[PDB]
Ligand binder design. Structure first.
Ligand SMILES: Cn1cccc1CNCCc1c[nH]c2ccccc12
Length: 279
Protein backbone atom coordinates (compact mmCIF):
# COMPACT_ATOMS: atom_id res chain seq x y z
CA UNK A 1 0.00 0.00 0.00
CA UNK A 2 1.06 3.61 -0.64
CA UNK A 3 -0.17 6.66 1.28
CA UNK A 4 0.71 9.79 -0.67
CA UNK A 5 1.50 13.08 1.05
CA UNK A 6 2.07 11.28 4.33
CA UNK A 7 3.63 12.90 7.40
CA UNK A 8 7.39 12.89 6.97
CA UNK A 9 7.92 10.39 9.79
CA UNK A 10 5.72 7.75 8.20
CA UNK A 11 7.51 8.19 4.89
CA UNK A 12 10.82 7.98 6.74
CA UNK A 13 10.05 4.65 8.38
CA UNK A 14 9.45 3.01 4.99
CA UNK A 15 12.42 4.61 3.21
CA UNK A 16 16.15 4.09 2.81
CA UNK A 17 16.47 7.88 2.33
CA UNK A 18 15.15 11.07 3.93
CA UNK A 19 13.24 13.61 1.88
CA UNK A 20 10.32 11.58 0.52
CA UNK A 21 6.64 11.91 1.32
CA UNK A 22 4.90 8.59 0.55
CA UNK A 23 4.46 5.90 3.21
CA UNK A 24 4.66 2.31 1.92
CA UNK A 25 3.43 -0.59 4.05
CA UNK A 26 1.88 -4.04 3.88
CA UNK A 27 -1.91 -3.78 3.81
CA UNK A 28 -2.23 -6.11 6.83
CA UNK A 29 -1.51 -2.85 8.69
CA UNK A 30 -1.33 -4.33 12.20
CA UNK A 31 -4.72 -6.04 11.95
CA UNK A 32 -5.15 -8.42 14.88
CA UNK A 33 -2.59 -6.65 17.10
CA UNK A 34 -3.27 -4.30 20.00
CA UNK A 35 -1.38 -1.25 21.26
CA UNK A 36 -1.89 0.22 24.73
CA UNK A 37 -1.17 3.95 24.92
CA UNK A 38 -0.33 4.71 28.55
CA UNK A 39 -0.67 8.48 28.73
CA UNK A 40 -3.20 11.31 29.21
CA UNK A 41 -5.96 9.31 27.49
CA UNK A 42 -7.24 9.07 23.91
CA UNK A 43 -10.07 10.99 22.25
CA UNK A 44 -11.55 7.79 20.86
CA UNK A 45 -14.35 9.66 19.05
CA UNK A 46 -11.83 11.27 16.69
CA UNK A 47 -12.79 10.21 13.12
CA UNK A 48 -9.13 9.36 12.51
CA UNK A 49 -9.44 6.32 14.83
CA UNK A 50 -12.37 4.78 12.90
CA UNK A 51 -13.83 3.13 15.99
CA UNK A 52 -10.59 1.22 16.67
CA UNK A 53 -9.68 3.22 19.81
CA UNK A 54 -11.21 2.89 23.26
CA UNK A 55 -10.36 3.89 26.81
CA UNK A 56 -9.94 0.90 29.12
CA UNK A 57 -8.69 2.47 32.38
CA UNK A 58 -8.31 5.80 34.15
CA UNK A 59 -7.06 6.76 37.60
CA UNK A 60 -8.79 10.18 37.50
CA UNK A 61 -12.33 11.61 37.41
CA UNK A 62 -12.52 11.14 33.64
CA UNK A 63 -11.00 8.88 31.03
CA UNK A 64 -11.12 11.73 28.52
CA UNK A 65 -7.90 13.21 27.19
CA UNK A 66 -8.08 16.81 28.38
CA UNK A 67 -4.52 17.47 27.24
CA UNK A 68 -3.97 16.16 23.69
CA UNK A 69 -0.63 14.41 24.26
CA UNK A 70 -2.11 10.91 24.53
CA UNK A 71 -4.37 11.47 21.53
CA UNK A 72 -1.38 12.64 19.48
CA UNK A 73 0.68 9.58 20.44
CA UNK A 74 -2.24 7.24 19.73
CA UNK A 75 -2.65 8.88 16.32
CA UNK A 76 0.97 8.11 15.45
CA UNK A 77 0.50 4.47 16.47
CA UNK A 78 -2.70 3.81 14.60
CA UNK A 79 -4.76 6.62 13.08
CA UNK A 80 -5.86 6.25 9.46
CA UNK A 81 -3.83 9.23 8.18
CA UNK A 82 -1.15 9.76 10.84
CA UNK A 83 -0.53 6.20 12.02
CA UNK A 84 2.07 3.52 11.39
CA UNK A 85 -0.27 0.54 12.02
CA UNK A 86 -3.52 1.71 10.50
CA UNK A 87 -5.62 -1.35 11.47
CA UNK A 88 -4.39 -2.02 15.02
CA UNK A 89 -6.69 -1.81 18.04
CA UNK A 90 -5.82 1.04 20.42
CA UNK A 91 -6.42 0.85 24.17
CA UNK A 92 -6.02 3.96 26.32
CA UNK A 93 -4.80 3.86 29.92
CA UNK A 94 -4.94 7.31 31.55
CA UNK A 95 -2.10 7.48 34.07
CA UNK A 96 -1.37 11.19 33.47
CA UNK A 97 -3.71 14.04 34.39
CA UNK A 98 -4.80 16.73 31.95
CA UNK A 99 -1.64 18.72 32.69
CA UNK A 100 0.46 15.71 31.66
CA UNK A 101 1.54 14.96 35.24
CA UNK A 102 1.31 11.69 37.12
CA UNK A 103 2.61 10.00 40.24
CA UNK A 104 5.03 7.14 39.71
CA UNK A 105 2.75 4.95 41.84
CA UNK A 106 -0.10 5.53 39.37
CA UNK A 107 2.16 4.90 36.37
CA UNK A 108 3.31 1.61 37.96
CA UNK A 109 -0.30 0.59 38.60
CA UNK A 110 -1.08 1.34 34.96
CA UNK A 111 1.75 -0.89 33.70
CA UNK A 112 0.65 -3.78 35.91
CA UNK A 113 -2.90 -3.14 34.70
CA UNK A 114 -1.84 -3.66 31.07
CA UNK A 115 0.04 -6.86 31.90
CA UNK A 116 -3.21 -8.34 33.22
CA UNK A 117 -5.73 -6.54 30.99
CA UNK A 118 -4.30 -8.02 27.79
CA UNK A 119 -5.85 -11.31 28.94
CA UNK A 120 -9.24 -9.57 28.58
CA UNK A 121 -8.59 -8.49 24.98
CA UNK A 122 -8.41 -10.19 21.58
CA UNK A 123 -4.90 -9.60 20.21
CA UNK A 124 -4.03 -12.78 18.31
CA UNK A 125 -1.08 -11.11 16.57
CA UNK A 126 0.42 -9.67 19.77
CA UNK A 127 0.39 -6.80 22.24
CA UNK A 128 2.45 -3.59 22.41
CA UNK A 129 2.56 -0.82 25.01
CA UNK A 130 3.70 2.72 24.21
CA UNK A 131 4.97 4.84 27.12
CA UNK A 132 5.63 8.45 26.08
CA UNK A 133 6.45 9.52 29.62
CA UNK A 134 9.13 9.36 32.26
CA UNK A 135 10.96 11.06 35.08
CA UNK A 136 14.02 10.66 37.24
CA UNK A 137 15.61 7.27 37.85
CA UNK A 138 13.41 4.88 39.83
CA UNK A 139 14.17 1.20 40.26
CA UNK A 140 10.47 0.57 40.97
CA UNK A 141 9.39 2.22 37.72
CA UNK A 142 12.03 0.27 35.79
CA UNK A 143 10.90 -2.97 37.43
CA UNK A 144 7.29 -2.29 36.46
CA UNK A 145 8.31 -1.81 32.82
CA UNK A 146 10.41 -4.99 33.01
CA UNK A 147 7.40 -6.91 34.35
CA UNK A 148 5.17 -5.62 31.58
CA UNK A 149 7.71 -6.73 28.97
CA UNK A 150 8.22 -10.09 30.70
CA UNK A 151 4.45 -10.68 30.62
CA UNK A 152 4.51 -10.77 26.80
CA UNK A 153 4.04 -7.11 25.80
CA UNK A 154 6.43 -5.24 23.52
CA UNK A 155 7.22 -2.18 25.65
CA UNK A 156 8.45 0.97 23.89
CA UNK A 157 9.42 3.94 26.07
CA UNK A 158 10.55 7.49 25.38
CA UNK A 159 14.22 8.26 26.01
CA UNK A 160 13.42 11.74 27.35
CA UNK A 161 13.95 15.32 26.20
CA UNK A 162 16.86 16.59 28.30
CA UNK A 163 19.66 16.30 25.70
CA UNK A 164 21.29 14.10 28.34
CA UNK A 165 22.20 10.49 29.05
CA UNK A 166 18.97 8.50 29.47
CA UNK A 167 20.63 6.35 32.17
CA UNK A 168 19.27 8.86 34.72
CA UNK A 169 15.61 8.57 33.66
CA UNK A 170 12.87 5.95 34.07
CA UNK A 171 11.51 3.87 32.46
CA UNK A 172 14.02 4.95 29.75
CA UNK A 173 16.91 3.33 31.65
CA UNK A 174 15.31 -0.13 32.01
CA UNK A 175 17.46 -2.46 29.86
CA UNK A 176 14.77 -4.97 28.90
CA UNK A 177 12.35 -2.52 27.21
CA UNK A 178 12.79 -0.61 23.94
CA UNK A 179 14.09 2.90 24.62
CA UNK A 180 13.42 5.30 21.75
CA UNK A 181 15.31 8.47 20.83
CA UNK A 182 14.13 11.13 18.38
CA UNK A 183 15.35 12.28 14.96
CA UNK A 184 14.34 15.05 12.55
CA UNK A 185 13.42 15.13 8.87
CA UNK A 186 17.06 15.73 7.87
CA UNK A 187 18.27 12.62 9.75
CA UNK A 188 19.78 14.67 12.59
CA UNK A 189 19.38 13.67 16.21
CA UNK A 190 16.59 15.87 17.53
CA UNK A 191 18.08 18.76 19.52
CA UNK A 192 16.32 17.70 22.74
CA UNK A 193 16.70 13.93 22.42
CA UNK A 194 18.37 12.04 25.22
CA UNK A 195 21.10 9.61 24.20
CA UNK A 196 23.34 6.97 25.76
CA UNK A 197 24.00 3.26 25.80
CA UNK A 198 20.46 2.48 27.05
CA UNK A 199 18.88 3.68 23.78
CA UNK A 200 17.85 0.90 21.40
CA UNK A 201 16.54 2.82 18.40
CA UNK A 202 15.63 6.25 17.01
CA UNK A 203 12.35 7.25 15.43
CA UNK A 204 10.91 10.44 13.92
CA UNK A 205 10.38 12.96 16.71
CA UNK A 206 10.69 16.55 15.42
CA UNK A 207 7.61 18.24 13.87
CA UNK A 208 5.30 15.21 13.89
CA UNK A 209 1.75 15.79 12.64
CA UNK A 210 -0.93 13.69 14.36
CA UNK A 211 -4.40 13.78 15.92
CA UNK A 212 -5.33 16.22 18.68
CA UNK A 213 -8.32 16.75 20.93
CA UNK A 214 -11.41 18.51 19.66
CA UNK A 215 -11.27 16.40 16.50
CA UNK A 216 -8.24 18.37 15.33
CA UNK A 217 -4.61 17.83 14.29
CA UNK A 218 -1.29 19.46 15.14
CA UNK A 219 2.44 18.99 14.82
CA UNK A 220 4.55 18.71 18.00
CA UNK A 221 8.00 17.41 18.87
CA UNK A 222 9.50 15.05 21.42
CA UNK A 223 10.76 11.59 22.15
CA UNK A 224 7.08 11.14 23.03
CA UNK A 225 6.44 11.33 19.27
CA UNK A 226 9.23 8.93 18.27
CA UNK A 227 8.07 6.24 20.72
CA UNK A 228 4.68 5.56 19.05
CA UNK A 229 6.36 5.25 15.65
CA UNK A 230 8.32 2.33 17.12
CA UNK A 231 5.29 0.92 18.97
CA UNK A 232 3.23 1.02 15.79
CA UNK A 233 6.09 -0.51 13.81
CA UNK A 234 6.29 -3.38 16.32
CA UNK A 235 2.55 -4.03 16.02
CA UNK A 236 2.84 -3.98 12.22
CA UNK A 237 5.79 -6.42 12.23
CA UNK A 238 4.11 -8.77 14.72
CA UNK A 239 1.01 -8.89 12.51
CA UNK A 240 3.28 -9.84 9.60
CA UNK A 241 4.70 -12.67 11.71
CA UNK A 242 8.24 -11.32 11.37
CA UNK A 243 8.90 -11.01 15.13
CA UNK A 244 7.33 -11.44 18.58
CA UNK A 245 6.83 -9.17 21.59
CA UNK A 246 9.94 -10.59 23.26
CA UNK A 247 12.16 -10.06 20.22
CA UNK A 248 10.63 -7.05 18.42
CA UNK A 249 13.01 -4.40 19.79
CA UNK A 250 16.03 -6.47 18.76
CA UNK A 251 14.46 -7.22 15.37
CA UNK A 252 13.78 -3.53 14.80
CA UNK A 253 17.41 -2.76 15.65
CA UNK A 254 18.60 -5.61 13.38
CA UNK A 255 16.60 -4.28 10.44
CA UNK A 256 17.05 -0.55 11.08
CA UNK A 257 18.66 1.96 8.76
CA UNK A 258 22.23 2.03 10.13
CA UNK A 259 24.70 4.88 10.39
CA UNK A 260 22.48 7.47 8.70
CA UNK A 261 21.84 9.88 11.59
CA UNK A 262 24.03 12.85 12.43
CA UNK A 263 25.04 14.19 15.86
CA UNK A 264 24.79 10.76 17.50
CA UNK A 265 27.27 10.76 20.42
CA UNK A 266 29.96 8.11 20.51
CA UNK A 267 28.51 5.08 22.31
CA UNK A 268 24.86 5.63 21.30
CA UNK A 269 23.36 3.42 18.59
CA UNK A 270 23.01 4.98 15.15
CA UNK A 271 19.85 3.10 14.17
CA UNK A 272 16.67 4.51 12.62
CA UNK A 273 13.45 2.48 12.68
CA UNK A 274 12.62 1.02 9.25
CA UNK A 275 9.85 -1.33 8.10
CA UNK A 276 11.87 -2.87 5.20
CA UNK A 277 8.69 -3.04 3.17
CA UNK A 278 9.32 -3.86 -0.48
CA UNK A 279 6.32 -2.72 -2.53
C1 LIG B 1 4.17 17.41 30.90
N1 LIG B 1 3.45 16.63 29.90
C2 LIG B 1 2.50 17.11 29.06
C3 LIG B 1 2.07 16.07 28.28
C4 LIG B 1 2.77 14.97 28.63
C5 LIG B 1 3.62 15.32 29.64
C6 LIG B 1 4.61 14.39 30.35
N2 LIG B 1 5.94 14.60 29.81
C7 LIG B 1 6.22 13.65 28.75
C8 LIG B 1 7.60 13.94 28.16
C9 LIG B 1 8.71 13.53 29.14
C10 LIG B 1 9.00 14.40 30.17
N3 LIG B 1 10.00 13.85 30.91
C11 LIG B 1 10.34 12.65 30.34
C12 LIG B 1 11.30 11.68 30.70
C13 LIG B 1 11.44 10.53 29.94
C14 LIG B 1 10.63 10.33 28.84
C15 LIG B 1 9.68 11.28 28.48
C16 LIG B 1 9.54 12.45 29.25
Amino acid sequence: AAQTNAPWGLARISSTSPGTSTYYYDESAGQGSCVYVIDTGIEASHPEFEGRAQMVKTYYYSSRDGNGHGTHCAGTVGSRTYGVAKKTQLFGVKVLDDNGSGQYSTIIAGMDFVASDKNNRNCPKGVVASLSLGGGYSSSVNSAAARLQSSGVMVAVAAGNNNADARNYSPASEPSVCTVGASDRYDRRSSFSNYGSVLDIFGPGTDILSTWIGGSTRSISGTSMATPHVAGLAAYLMTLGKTTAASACRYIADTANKGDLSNIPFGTVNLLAYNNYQA
